[PDB]
Design a binder for these strands. Sequence first.
RNA 1: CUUUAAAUCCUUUAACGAGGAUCCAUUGGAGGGCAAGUCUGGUGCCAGCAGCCGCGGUAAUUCCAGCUCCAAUAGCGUAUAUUAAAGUUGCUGCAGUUAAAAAGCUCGUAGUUGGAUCU
Lengths: 180, 82, 141, 29, 218
Amino acid sequence: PVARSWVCRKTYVTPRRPFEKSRLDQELKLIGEYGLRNKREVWRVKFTLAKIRKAARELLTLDEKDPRRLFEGNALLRRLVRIGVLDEGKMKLDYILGLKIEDFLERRLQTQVFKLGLAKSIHHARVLIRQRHIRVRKQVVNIPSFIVRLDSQKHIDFSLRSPYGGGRPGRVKRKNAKKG
Amino acid sequence: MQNDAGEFVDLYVPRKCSASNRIIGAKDHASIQMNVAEVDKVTGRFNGQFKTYAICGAIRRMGESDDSILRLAKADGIVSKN
Amino acid sequence: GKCRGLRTARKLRSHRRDQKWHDKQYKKAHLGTALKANPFGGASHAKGIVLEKVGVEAKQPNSAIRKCVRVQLIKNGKKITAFVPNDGCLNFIEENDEVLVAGFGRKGHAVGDIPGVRFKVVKVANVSLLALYKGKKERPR
Amino acid sequence: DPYEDFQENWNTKHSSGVTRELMRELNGG
Amino acid sequence: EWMPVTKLGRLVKDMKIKSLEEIYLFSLPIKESEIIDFFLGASLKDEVLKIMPVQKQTRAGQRTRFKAFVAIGDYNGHVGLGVKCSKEVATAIRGAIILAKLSIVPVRRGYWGNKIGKPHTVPCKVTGRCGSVLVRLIPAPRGTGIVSAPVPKKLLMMAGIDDCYTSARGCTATLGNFAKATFDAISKTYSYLTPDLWKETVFTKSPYQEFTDHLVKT
RNA sequence: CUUUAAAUCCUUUAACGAGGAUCCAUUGGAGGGCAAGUCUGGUGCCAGCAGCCGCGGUAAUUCCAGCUCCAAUAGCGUAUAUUAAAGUUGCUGCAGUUAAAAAGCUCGUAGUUGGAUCU
């Protein structure tokens, strides 16, 4: 008897057909548009939408005035609106079935850093995040797959202890200043 | 056929067999559409109107298109009683 | 046709569990004779002593000599012919050697050309054959 | 020429390769 | 240059018929592929499915001929499936493209749950059947994609079905019987009488009746 | 420094720490199934490859290597158990003329199933 917890869970699912042309092409396009590391980063986001769609497929079978459909149908819509994947006016339960992978991949912090003009490519943004140059309101974030919420989106900046922000110059500028 | 907003979302509305209410399909090449002429009731000459009956191909392959035309035209008063 | 009534549950399940024994996969894995004939005894791998190197002749629509090894297992003393995969891998094998033997892929059936050989060699003298073949390790002296 | 390769070699050892090259030629890519 | 030989091609060429749905409404047989090229045309894409060599034994040896299975389709629209045998693969493919344009049907699309938007799936469960192979199309919700084997997936995506469930039966290794079976199921989507098609059919004039004064000048 | 019983680890901060940034990514493959080379040399039914069909007998798209390319990636092969695929155990949901298969015939207990009809 130990005082631990063994609850864990996988975040992705491998496809059933391992070498299927027109799946490889589409996933490589999704990597290239967003600058992902491998195919598991794509399958991770396929897995969250497949769970969201399974959760909405069962609420759509219950009675329209059932308390579970009204209660968990409104929590599921609130989260999608909050992280910016749905629209405010589209808060019926049937528009969840019209969501796509790219709607979730837009809300990564890496694409938000690229799209807010902090970086100049989708690969400059990941390498900016990973070496501690971006913060969200006070907090330096290291994680490229940080799903930005709609209210915490305009608070993205350059992390005051970084050369691009408050600006003690880096290890390389300091050495070149010492040299000559 | 119709969505919730009320648009008609359908390529076309197919015809139905006038004898047996079956949908006459796109590649139903044995099916018929036949006009039967209407006459003026004092000269017995062709008025200009007609009466359209469509009959699907299975009814005609059954041999029942003759009786079906006959009882459709009998209901319109084109063929008299007896 | 089959019975369908509302009180037919005993007839339905006693017929299915009696017709289940006519399936080859059920009869193999639920009778116990096939497990007592398996020299591994249900294990994935085993270990034996190399008795002699043996050349087995390929089956008719092609022609070669496959380089097998007759090996007597440690845990039950059963004898086994086992195939040594790549070329010049029979050179790595002495006699009276510790050897590690796996299955050959078809779960107890003989893989294509080699007649009646269900097993293959994985390690020799506690060194893997792949490490000897690609030159990563050598046989100890 | 994938057409001529296919029509000559469809029975031989290289039948699957010339079939794949013909399908590559036909269905874009 | 198209010199049409039928009564319908003369009407199609002279701008008297405005859509393919008029010819489908009156179920007229289409004997020239230039009608299809006139109507769909710039949005009609083809895929060769299998080149199949067949052999007849003869007194002198054996003649080898080649069978091409060509599926054509207007995405959101219509789908056809042609098969042609020939002694040469290029002529077999061109003849199968003509014969695939010739056998083009409309496919009715429906809704899985509530009818909000455009139709995206089959209107109901339709089974197609061709030589031991049974293919069944089951309606699926918005966005599942096609859950099928790779052979009906081609024909179904060409037909414009966004998302569907499928179940096959039989010997589906024969790609001919497995392609024509789903084509039989797609062609059944307009023949199924559902309660929205329950209204009485007001009849209109056939194109050979309305344009009987234009057709006599030619 | 903080952490801790005391420590370690992580987190926080000095100083040092990158150009072939040699501060070097691997495991399996490249005829089909199944993404990706009938390029090149060696071998010559041998050695071997190959789950299966097959490759190899002096032009090897399949062996042994070089080069190039493909897939997954700090992971990736192999063996065995097991689940799906299997509507090939079938309640949903299979089959029994000729492919495996219906009892020689009738009787007959249990079992299973049992016609309308009452506000």
